[PDB]
Subunit: 255 residues, 4 copies
């Protein structure tokens, strides 16, 4: 049971991170919403109750994550679980001949920084915090869960930067599990397909709906609560480690 | 919730299948233990109560599986879930030059027959049973879960036939999910690493210690109840489909 | 160079196997076309010249493959390369509610037997033949190259049996390579996407053209000589072992 | 044949990149060695003759890459092939309880920037130069070949940053292929295992020999010429696209 656990959730003010916070808190765990100052994390934490607090932070900054982790320790005593949900998307072709347009370097760099470097920043710092926990009866001190994407495996036209960042997450999952194995911290990754969150609000309704119609079964966007459910499953199951799990209705993305 | 669901579980007399039955019955589901007549399936079904019965069957035989499925309908009225745990193992090198010895054809055929064909036989016949169910609120008529193995991905020396059979289960996981998507039957696969079923627990203690010593974290054989927990998670999560999940404590098998 | 090498090519009377034989014989190697009696191997062996012969054989049969290998030794002195191209296709849904149709067991079995068991039968027997070769300066005694398919990874609707058989080939690639590594026999697998061979002729022209239109680049079916080129590249490169190579114009198959 | 093609080879002053240049120039191609100013690339270009020149540049830099590509256009008129070999390595645990030590953020950022962003930097700019070529008979305008690592798949203890960078390479291979498919530019990636290059010089001789000893077959480090051979095979085969190829003697890395 997740009752009593302390979880730090990046991107916790919105979409999949928020849904995760809701479910876990609803089960008696405590949540720390690590999100940008501009988000509505403060209001979300206020709605989720006394077992939920907001820690304003940018995941690409060492100092910010240190501050939020210190806050989490200070309020809830320890960190049992970390969920990397902070992330951003861009659509931009590598090169467009007809338009004579080139993907910009900084668009590639900014996506890499938040999604990949930002996730690793939280991982390396939170691992030091989980290192201080006494191992439970099973030898465990903590659980770390990251968010990749099926774009790591079937990136679509326009998805080079996103794919690189999420492929980086997939690739570093096993080595980081190996690193932390002697101190009993599990490391797992979820690769969502298409989910109904504000991430997708930026696209034409005909665009979303089309995408939606491609999921083999069930034929719809995933529900953020379904992501949350898989997070809990992973937290609960002591033998799940070093793996990436597709959560995507069996879709395979076309160009 | 799996309360009230009806599950047909092959290899239900022992190890992973048995663990799955115990947990699902313990959670309010009904279970049919599908296994060979000479096994202890009857006793395990008796032990598990009125919501559990034993159906003798060889999964390589169409008639037997038809017989078992007819028994399940007659006893519990419908089938909501199928879990393929029935399997065998062999250790035999492709060729041994020092011994002058060749893997026998029928050793290869037998393992294929039980592990791969047998699983497909249950899937195709149980899909036809599930197609008679009225779709639930989610439009779902059924969930089928197969058992592969990490040997699908890192088959060891001696494991050519087993690896072949488990790779086949992995390979057909998506197309079967695609096939049955229009009727709302999700198809998922679990790839166990090293688990404490009679297959391993009946080995010499030094060997058990050695095998456990290979799992990065936690450094022990998997508990069959952990497989069962994962079966339940997949049953409960409506968006898991067409995927293979490694359940293995982050091990990667060496030759 | 492949110059002077002896290759036994199963499925050599047609399509990819035939083109492999054409290229290799063209590159100074000798080829044995291993294929069924009713195939046109005899005529194809005559067309290719003195350095190519036909060995009639069914790859699911121990004695036949034994007879064909003995033919190959007696005629060309040794065996240095084996390429498994013998294979069959079927299109059949696991279950079709609207049509009231269930995949037959014997369609699943026949596909397994020829494609998967047949390939392992050739592998296990030819390995013992290569093990009698004295290793070259690089320690190598033989190269074995198998044919899987992208259906091992993206099985389409109707391809469950095919995908099972090819996923099998993929899964046993590494263990067999591990098995034979002490005696210097490399094991590699090619996964072709879509190629213009007599295999696809049964299909309606419209489907063939539609499939062709979906290969991203180059936008066409693969030419069998392109497969042949990859086989030579694998033969020639000493460090390629235990791997599966997609040859498919970047396509990813949809349902 | 590669005779007459113009290839831009990053990391061309050393190891795999150098060996690639050696082989292609030897086969009649022209090469531009793109490498750092303090590398001995000039000396290597001078040694390779009229058909090889050096372009001093840091792949993390837009201006430097623009300069080296313009240098290429001016010396050989066009660019037909790009090979990304530029790369660095670091060994550093995510978190080390024993030493109470944490992976630095900048160690992670540096490896990403050189290995992953730098590779994307070259690809996006060179795609612009190949776009200018009239398509050949097969509609092809160019070939892009990247260097990942088996660390993308089995990152070792200490390899998190490196694994992240090469996993990124693997991830973006398909989307970039799909991006450039309508203009006829193929994108391919090689994942080398262990190769005898200066990359490995800074390791203790013991680690090196132990690493070499775990290659199943052939049991040695890979020869840089063997990388070069594979590059050539990919350039030559028109139907290889959107794929990653392991070149590693069938090794699988342990923690
Ligand atoms: N939803 C999905 O379907 C999927 C999500 N994910 C990931 O899940 C995590 C949570 O995201 P979220 O909750 O959905 O978004 P959110 O914005 O509501 O919340 C994120 C939070 O992070 C917080 N945050 C942010 N930065 C920081 C920071 N620095 N520090 C701390 N906190 C930070 C932020 O404030 C916010 O609260 C992130 O890692 C996502 O990348 C992966 C696969 C799926 N997934 C589907 C995706 C699609 S369809 N695209 C398309 C696409 O690729 N197209 C081209 C090809 C064809 C498809 C159509 C377009 C797209 C969509 C919109 C815009 C551009 C591009 C992209 N990525 C996708 N991911
Ligand atoms: N061509 C391709 O695109 C592909 C081929 N391959 C494989 O390559 C090998 C050689 O095949 P071939 O040379 O193309 O055929 P061939 O008939 O010319 O040569 C075979 C030889 O083997 C010999 N032989 C045979 N048996 C033996 C034996 N016992 N012993 C000894 N020798 C034997 C036989 O006599 C003959 O000489 C085989 O192992 C194939 O499986 C894999 C990927 C591709 N590949 C593409 C494929 C497609 S599109 N399908 C579709 C499909 O799946 N559909 C569903 C999804 C939507 C798309 C439309 C249909 C299909 C096609 C035809 C009928 C049903 C279904 C199937 N398989 C495919 N494989
Ligand atoms: N060799 C191999 O086995 C492998 C190589 N590769 C890649 O192949 C490409 C060519 O590299 P190279 O020719 O081998 O090196 P090089 O130095 O001779 O040439 C690189 C050139 O790029 C140039 N260059 C550079 N930067 C730039 C730039 N900015 N702009 C422009 N040009 C640049 C540079 O000047 C130089 O000329 C690079 O992209 C490599 O990353 C992948 C898998 C293999 N591969 C094996 C690897 C191993 S065993 N490690 C271990 C490890 O991970 N350990 C932990 C786990 C346990 C095992 C023991 C240690 C390691 C080794 C050394 C130091 C630290 C760590 C790392 N990476 C590996 N990659
Ligand atoms: N335990 C591990 O280390 C491990 C690792 C990977 C995969 N697996 C797989 O997990 C699944 C369950 O294994 P287990 O550990 O529970 O093994 P087990 O031997 O404890 O149980 C196997 C069950 O399958 C039954 N069975 C065998 N042939 C049958 C047939 N022809 N028809 C019907 N029933 C048949 C056996 O009688 C037995 O009850 C198998 O597919 C196995 O290959 C196990």
């Amino acid at each position: 049971s997740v009752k009593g656990l302390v979880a730090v959730i990046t991107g916790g003010a919105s979409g999949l991170g928020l849904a995760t916070a809701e479910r876990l808190v609803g089960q008696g765990a405590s949540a720390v919403l690590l999100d940008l100052p501009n988000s509505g994390g403060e209001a979300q934490a206020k709605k989720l109750g006394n077992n939920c607090v907001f820690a304003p932070a940018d995941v690409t900054s060492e100092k910010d994550v240190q501050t939020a982790l210190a806050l989490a320790k200070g309020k809830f005593g320890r960190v049992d679980v970390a969920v990397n949900c902070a992330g951003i998307a861009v659509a931009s072709k590598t090169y467009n001949l007809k338009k004579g347009q080139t993907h910009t370097l900084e668009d590639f760099q900014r996506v890499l920084d938040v999604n990949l470097m930002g996730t690793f920043n939280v991982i390396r710092l939170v691992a030091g915090e989980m290192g201080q926990n006494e191992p439970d009866q099973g030898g465990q001190r903590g659980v770390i869960i990251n968010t990749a994407s099926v774009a790591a495996f079937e990136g679509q036209v326009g998805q080079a930067a996103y794919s690189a960042s999420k492929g980086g997450i997939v690739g570093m999952t096993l080595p980081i599990a190996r690193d932390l194995a002697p101190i009993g911290i599990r490391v797992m990754t979820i690769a969502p397909g298409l989910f109904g969150t504000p991430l997708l609000t930026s696209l034409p309704e005909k665009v979303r709906n089309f995408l939606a119609s491609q999921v083999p079964f069930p034929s719809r966007l995933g529900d953020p609560a379904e992501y949350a459910h898989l997070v809990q499953a992973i937290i609960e199951n002591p033998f799940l480690n070093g793996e990436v799990i597709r959560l995507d209705g069996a879709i395979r993305m076309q160009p």
